[PDB]
């Protein structure tokens, strides 16, 4: 019920929709649209590329719990970290539990497989960021929160791969709002990465939510991995 939840609500919703758009659907409220399990199963089919069991019909309490359990069984089978998520809480629209469940899904499907110099998962994603921004004198990535507040890290990641898209030299470290908005707009327009973070909130929050930032950064990783050259979106 604070800034942590607010930032995760924004970012996790955006991430989920960046995938569901490939299934011809979208959610409009993350604490309501997964309650019957239907869109949750669809999200899992998109990010895994597999077909889950056929969803049961009927809007009865028992049916919804059934669909959610099908989803929970599927993510367990795919190695998503277990964190005591309960089908009941998901069906009842418990926001804390829902965001917690979505986080484990993001971590498994967008971050865990990342491999960089024998380093993997979150640690691998961080190393990738550090290696790519190494040449930038005004950037020093050391985490997935404070290190990104001035926006230069995001701008540097983009400039490193597509220099023509950002006039990095004109960016000032003491002008974080400008830097963040520049990176977010360029990523949305040229890299097909939806805006998942609110610039003003990043600048105003002593310590921005690392799960939200990690989610956004992982989208940059995938946009620059070259995987799009051999994999069909869906």
UniProtKB/Swiss-Prot annotation:
The modification N6-acetyllysine is found at residues 70, 170. Residues 5-222 are annotated as: Actin-binding. It is found in: Cytoplasm, Cytoskeleton; Cytoplasm, Myofibril, Sarcomere, Z line; Cell membrane; Cell junction. Changing residue 80 to I: In BDPLT15; the mutation dominantly affects the actin filament assembly likely resulting in abnormal cytoskeletal organization. Residues 6-110, 119-225 form the Calponin-homology (CH) domain. It comes from the Eukaryota. Belongs to the alpha-actinin family. It is linked to Bleeding disorder, platelet-type, 15: An autosomal dominant form of macrothrombocytopenia. Affected individuals usually have no or only mild bleeding tendency, such as epistaxis. Laboratory studies show decreased numbers of large platelets and anisocytosis, but the platelets show no in vitro functional abnormalities. Homodimer; antiparallel. Interacts with MYOZ2, TTID and LPP. Interacts with DDN. Interacts with PSD. Interacts with MICALL2. Interacts with DNM2 and CTTN. Interacts with PDLIM1. Interacts with PDLIM2. Interacts with PDLIM4 (via PDZ domain). Interacts with IGSF8. F-actin cross-linking protein which is thought to anchor actin to a variety of intracellular structures. Association with IGSF8 regulates the immune synapse formation and is required for efficient T-cell activation. This is Alpha-actinin-1.
């Amino acid at each position: 019920a604070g800034h942590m939840e607010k930032q995760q609500r924004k970012t996790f919703t955006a991430w989920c929709n960046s995938h569901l758009r490939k299934a011809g659907t979208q959610i409009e409220n993350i604490e309501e649209d997964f309650r019957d399990g239907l869109k949750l199963m669809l999200l899992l089919e998109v990010i895994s590329g597999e077909r889950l069991a056929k969803p049961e019909r009927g809007k009865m309490r028992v049916h919804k719990i059934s669909n959610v359990n099908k989803a929970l069984d599927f993510i367990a089978s795919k190695g998503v970290k277990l964190v005591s998520i309960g089908a009941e809480e998901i069906v009842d629209g418990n926001v804390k539990m829902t965001l917690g469940m979505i986080w484990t899904i993001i971590l498994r499907f967008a971050i865990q497989d990342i491999s960089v110099e024998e380093t993997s998962a979150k640690e691998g994603l961080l190393l990738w960021c550090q290696r790519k921004t190494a040449p930038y004198k005004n950037v020093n990535i050391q985490n997935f929160h404070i290190s990104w507040k001035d926006g230069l890290g995001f701008c540097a990641l983009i400039h490193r791969h597509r220099p023509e898209l950002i006039d990095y030299g004109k960016l000032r470290k003491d002008d974080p709002l400008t830097n963040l908005n520049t990176a977010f707009d360029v990523a949305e327009k040229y890299l097909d990465i939806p805006k998942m973070l609110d610039a003003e909130d990043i600048v105003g929050t002593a310590r921005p939510d690392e799960k939200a930032i990690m989610t956004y950064v992982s989208s940059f990783y995938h946009a620059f991995s070259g995987a799009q050259e051999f994999l069909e979106p869906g």
